[PDB]
């Protein structure tokens, strides 16, 4: 009879996933006293080395490190890696999505998007085909290191949102009726 696993969410930010980092988690668990008179309280440091590019849901288990409130086997402590909301990107496995907003005019007459990168630069990507709503374009190798092959990286994905007007003049309306494909 071993206590059922005790689960703790380990919130890591995207920059931490990018570089890999260290997390010290201090537990206070209950431990039978050196003499079985008391169930005491004890501190311990559990150090998790977050590998570069690990994915949400990765399990880091420290066996038997839960309470000994019982005369039975203490539960495993299982740290579960969660992604922390980013203010620019949305993570996606080893890819990072960049949401980019454009005018309808830009979606059909072309644009430049100056795309932020993980290392705080911007990358020009000019567009010259129709940009549909929800269209993705990969910028290869500008995502997160692949946790297994961390010399190699995934990609950065540009996902488009196309901003329409409310009002269109009469002349524009007649023209767009005559000229639009399908």
């Amino acid at each position: 009879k071993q206590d059922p696993p005790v689960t703790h969410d380990l919130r890591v930010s995207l920059e931490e996933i990018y570089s890999g980092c260290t997390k010290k988690m201090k537990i206070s668990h209950k431990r039978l006293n050196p003499d079985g008179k008391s169930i005491r309280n004890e501190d311990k440091i559990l150090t998790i080395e977050v590998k570069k590019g690990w994915k949400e849901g990765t399990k880091i288990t420290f066996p038997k490190e839960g309470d000994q409130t019982s005369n039975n086997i203490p539960a495993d402590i299982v740290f579960v890696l969660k992604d922390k909301p980013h203010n620019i990107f949305k993570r996606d496995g080893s890819d990072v999505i960049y949401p980019a907003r454009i005018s309808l005019r830009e979606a059909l007459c072309g644009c430049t998007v100056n795309v932020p990168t993980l290392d705080g630069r911007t990358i020009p990507v000019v567009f010259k085909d129709v940009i549909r709503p929800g269209m993705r374009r990969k910028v290869p190798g500008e995502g997160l290191p692949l946790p297994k092959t961390p010399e190699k990286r995934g990609d950065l994905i540009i996902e488009f949102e196309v901003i329409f007007p409310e009002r269109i003049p009469q002349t524009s309306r007649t023209v767009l009726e005559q000229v639009l494909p399908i």
Binding site: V6, M25, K26, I27, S28, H29, E65, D67, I77
Partner: peptide, 8 residues
């Protein structure tokens, strides 16, 4: 359940 907390 045991108490857990990040530290430097």
């Amino acid at each position: 359940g045991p108490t857990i907390e990040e530290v430097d």
